[PDB]
From a paper:
Coat protein 1 ([name]) coated vesicles function in retrograde trafficking between the Golgi apparatus and the Endoplasmic Reticulum (ER), and between the Golgi cisternae in both retrograde and anterograde directions. Coatomer (the [name] complex) is a heteroheptameric protein complex, consisting of α, β, β’, γ, δ, ε and ζ subunits. [name]-GTP recruits the protein complex coatomer from the cytoplasm and anchors it at the membrane. Polymerization of coatomer at the membrane assembles the [name] coat, which recruits cargo molecules and membrane machinery to the assembly site.
The linkage structures are at lower resolution than that of the leaf, so we fitted our leaf structure as a rigid body to assess which subunits are close to one another in the linkages. Consistent with our previously published structures the central contacts in linkages I and IV are made by the αε-COP subunits, and those in linkage II are made by the δ-COP MHD. Interestingly neither ε-COP nor the δ-COP MHD are essential for [name] function and the combined deletion of both is not lethal for yeast. While the contacts formed by these proteins at the linkages may play a regulatory role, they are therefore not essential for [name] function. We found that β[name] is close to the N-terminal β-propeller of β’-COP in a neighbouring triad, and approaches the trunk domain of β-COP. While the low-resolution of the linkage structures precludes more detailed interpretation, the proximity of the peripheral β[name] molecule to neighbouring triads suggests that β[name] could modulate inter-triad interactions.
Residue numbers in the entry:
A (entry chain C): 605 to 843
B (entry chain A): 703 to 813
The structure:
Amino acid sequence: MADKVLPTIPKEQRTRVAHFLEKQGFKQQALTVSTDPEHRFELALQLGELKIAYQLAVEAESEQKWKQLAELAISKCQFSLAQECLHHAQDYGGLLLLATASGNASMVNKLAEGAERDGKNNVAFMSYFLQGKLDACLELLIRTGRLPEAAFLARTYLPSQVSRVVKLWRENLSKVNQKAAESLADPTEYENLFPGLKEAFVVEEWVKETHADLWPAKQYPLVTPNEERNVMEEAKGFQ
Amino acid sequence: LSFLYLITGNLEKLRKMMKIAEIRKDMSGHYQNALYLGDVSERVRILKNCGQKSLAYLSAATHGLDEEAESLKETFDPEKETIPDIDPNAKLLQPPAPIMPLDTNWPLLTV
């Protein structure tokens, strides 16, 4: 009966009543009438026509929508898309949590790009590492003035930037003269670098490694490939 | 300090520390223990924070252990239905094979 009336209601009317309908709990039906982007939106949150919600979003026109929505999407476990929205949002933090949990390089490159974006030094490093990229970690340091720290990495996992880098750090120190403050040596004397001969470089292990990076470590797994990184690793690594 | 420990090419100290801060709660931090590692135990805890078998699967599958994550997931009345890219594809690799150190201890000189 009402439907005959329905033509003979418009804009705003629909809204009020929609709220009534919503009160009725005739959410779907409430959806059908739906009439305000906001109105549609909130209801949409309740409702979850997911795709449908997207169309309403269309171009959302507010990350806040995406943020709100992201939580919702994620709940529905409509991730493929969620990723698209979140990505669309480029809302890195939550998105990272998923991306990381299954794992992914690709995410990492784009993200790397992002990593560059973020404005505090630290996250970006994990990324660089995570990717496996000393190089990236070290380059990053150059901008931030992480210098003592950069040396440790450069030493540990040797890109022998310890030599290069140390000179520069030392130079800062140098600026701030005093001989102790200057501090000096790479192959020999103070440090014996390559003459010490101990644990962050060489070819053979490295060759084995070269491959290693390429295969999946294995134990028993899924399509989501292996790498391990534990006891075993220590042993071969020494070899 | 943990960072120093992972920088260096050795494994325990971070792990006790990991215990002792895991043990001091967490929602975003477990991550620290996992990467340089393969294996994590965090997952036992983690699932409890999540507990949607989702995290548990994503994480799970490779030790050849996707499976328990599914068992619960089913029990619940599952809710997963779509996923995004993420297939383990970034390198947790680097650190210190023989010749050209670590640095537990770092020598220098005033000279």
